[PDB]
């Protein structure tokens, strides 16, 4: 009955965002100049996450060191060694006194730096951990490559629920501003909106062509954008249950590896694998100024909570605080 | 410029010192990726263990770190990207099973032509050679005519030639392949890995110095 759902979504597709957005004041060429470039990582970077204080941020690299910066002054604050050299995630607590990581070895190590060694290790997954985002400083939603996310609990250390609905590997999840729902972009070219309390999928947005390496929520919480290996970012609306705008441009063959939204949700800052991140207009489907300052691949991206800066780590072992 | 700021800068400098020490001790260890099918004696190559299942062994006072990933599902298209700075890929192959050998060839072909592993040289171990000898002394249409450049020699060099053809089909100076004929009771595998890794680092240095 998939054709029935396709027809139902077609029926409500009476208007197109590109056509509806035909008459709006365009955003001029965005000139984002590298304000800071944080160096000190032995090897390529894999993930990072801005803190709630809008300045402190964490970065995890291949070298096996989890490092906490201070983007305002660039003065490091912590360099926590890892129990495994392979990590592909980084989590920040809304309180700001907890940090998480993980990857191969299937452990979501969680550090308590409000004394910095370990506070818990979550060992329920049968595949590589991909992305973990702190929920309330006591529950940590966690993806994994065994095709199932999970909502954990620090005190018990065991899954509270399990979102076993996917078919491929889960790559990235983004919590809603309400902290009630979240999504997860899998490798089966889909992205399912889950429910934290109910613990069951509510929608599936099968509108991609290949894996989905990153995902982010709209600031209002009623839409989210996905980044694929088709070199195309798509914007999905929860209410309309269909794709709105596809940010695909010719002469771009490298697949996206990160995506994030601006404070007003106007610019989709998508970090590509073509040596240089891009900036897309959220509601115009047009390319704004490119942010090319990395000599290697871009492996992460994070826009500050207050929107004052956007950091784009890459595989050259350098974090750059653009603005 | 303040009370806490100078302490913060001191902490940053200390962290930088520890990072520099870790960099000094890190580039000296050559991480190795071990990729073999279930039937292949990839654990037997670890049966020579010398101090995911890491096995850290050093030869001539230089450390090699060996990583074999077996706890993950059989969809190694996204967790293999993590193994991009590995010095060499130790591809272990069971040379006895003719039926399963085509799968090993296809796996090696996928490893060789990969976009992200386009700069990783591969050490190829065709172990269980004793089983191969026993089988021949007691599938592929390319064996109809073939001259080695007893019959066990012809068979083993046929398998090696197939692997080498797969390697050189898209071969380039960026990365090379080093075949070997391992036995289940061979203890010299450490020396073979050492010589191969030495040549890999030598070629990396040659590329860096622009002598080529």
């Amino acid at each position, epitope marked *: 009955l998939k054709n029935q759902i396709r027809d139902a979504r077609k029926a409500c597709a009476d208007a197109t965002l590109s056509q509806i957005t035909n008459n709006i004041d365009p955003v001029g060429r965005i000139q984002m100049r590298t304000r800071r470039t944080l160096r000190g990582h032995l090897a390529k970077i894999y993930a990072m996450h801005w803190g709630t204080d809008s300045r402190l941020l964490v970065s995890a690299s291949q070298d096996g060191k989890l490092i906490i910066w201070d983007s305002y002054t660039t003065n490091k604050v912590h360099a926590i060694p890892l129990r495994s050299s392979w990590v592909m995630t980084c989590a920040y607590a809304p309180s700001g006194n907890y940090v998480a990581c993980g990857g191969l070895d299937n452990i979501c190590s969680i550090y308590n730096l409000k004394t910095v060694r370990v506070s818990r290790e979550l060992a329920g997954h049968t595949g590589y951990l991909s992305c973990c985002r702190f929920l309330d400083d006591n529950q940590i939603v966690t993806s994994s490559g065994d095709t199932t996310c999970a909502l954990w609990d620090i005190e018990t250390g065991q899954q509270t629920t399990t979102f076993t609905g996917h*078919t491929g590997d889960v790559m990235s999840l983004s919590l809603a501003p309400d902290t009630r729902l979240f999504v997860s972009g899998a490798c089966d070219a889909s992205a399912k909106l889950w429910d934290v309390r109910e613990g069951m999928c509510r929608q599936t947005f099968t509108g991609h*062509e290949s894996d989905i390496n990153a995902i982010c929520f709209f600031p209002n919480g009623n839409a989210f954008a996905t980044g694929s290996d088709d070199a195309t970012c798509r914007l999905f609306d929860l209410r309309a249950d269909q794709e709105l705008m596809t940010y695909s441009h010719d002469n771009i063959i490298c697949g996206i590896t990160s995506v994030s939204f601006s404070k007003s949700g106007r610019l989709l800052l998508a970090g590509y694998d073509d040596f240089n991140c891009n900036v897309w207009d959220a509601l115009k489907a047009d390319r704004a100024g490119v942010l090319a300052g990395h000599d290697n691949r871009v492996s992460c991206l994070g826009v500050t909570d207050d929107g004052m800066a956007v950091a784009t780590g890459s595989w050259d072992s350098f974090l750059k605080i653009w603005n | 410029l303040s009370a806490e700021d100078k302490a913060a800068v001191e902490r940053s400098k200390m962290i930088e010192k520890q990072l520099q020490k870790d960099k000094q001790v890190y580039r000296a260890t050559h991480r190795l990726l071990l990729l073999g099918a279930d039937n292949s004696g990839k654990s037997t190559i670890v049966k020579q263990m010398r101090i995911i299942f890491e096995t850290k062994f050093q030869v001539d006072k230089v450390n090699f770190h060996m990583f074999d990933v077996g706890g993950q599902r059989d969809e190694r*298209r996204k967790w293999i990207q993590c193994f991009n700075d590995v010095t060499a890929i130790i591809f272990v192959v069971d040379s006895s099973d003719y039926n399963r050998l085509q*799968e090993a060839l296809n796996d090696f072909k996928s490893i060789w032509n*990969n976009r992200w592993l386009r700069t990783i040289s591969v050490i190829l171990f065709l172990n269980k050679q004793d089983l191969l000898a026993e089988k021949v002394l007691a599938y592929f249409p390319e064996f109809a005519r073939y001259t080695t450049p007893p019959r066990v020699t012809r068979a083993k060099y046929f398998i090696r030639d197939e692997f080498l053809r797969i390697s050189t089909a898209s071969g380039d100076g960026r990365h090379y392949c080093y075949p070997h004929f391992t036995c289940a009771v061979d203890t010299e595998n450490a020396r073979r890995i050492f010589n191969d890794c030495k040549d890999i680092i030598l070629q990396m240095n040659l590329r860096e110095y622009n002598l080529v």
Partner: nanobody, 126 residues
Framework: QVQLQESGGGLVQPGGSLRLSCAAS????????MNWVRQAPGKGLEWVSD????????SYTGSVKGRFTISRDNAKNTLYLQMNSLKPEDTAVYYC?????????????????????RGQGTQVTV
């Protein structure tokens, strides 16, 4: 949404020929390398053929080399696998699979036990 279905392989006597066609939908059919794949009764998932997005780069497995033909057509999203020499042990099942990434010949899980861009598979018997 990627969805691949194949038809035209249910049963054929050992002598003769058989034509397999795998239909492609939901994605651009000029950027992805398509492979064919088999299964066996109580065995693993094999690998047979391949063809690049450009049109002319065909790889094969040793067992069926020289008696199987593969062709793909752009502007009409479908795949083909001509089989003009049938042998009893090559007649278990014939899946249809796509290489995960476009503009890239690197395929790793085209024969994984639980793949996402694989067709439902057409039963083949002899």
């Amino acid at each position: 949404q990627v969805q691949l279905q194949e038809s035209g392989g249910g049963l054929v006597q050992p002598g003769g020929s058989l034509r397999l066609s795998c239909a492609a939908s939901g994605f651009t059919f000029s950027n992805y390398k398509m492979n064919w794949v088999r299964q066996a009764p109580g065995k693993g998932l094999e690998w047979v053929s391949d063809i690049s997005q450009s049109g002319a780069s065909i790889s094969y497995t040793g067992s069926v080399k020289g008696r199987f033909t593969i062709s793909r057509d752009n502007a009409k999203n479908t795949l083909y696998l001509q089989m003009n020499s049938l042998k009893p042990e090559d007649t278990a099942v014939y899946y249809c699979a796509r290489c995960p990434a476009p503009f890239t010949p690197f395929c790793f899980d085209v024969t994984s036990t639980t793949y996402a861009y694989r067709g439902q598979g057409t039963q083949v018997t002899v």
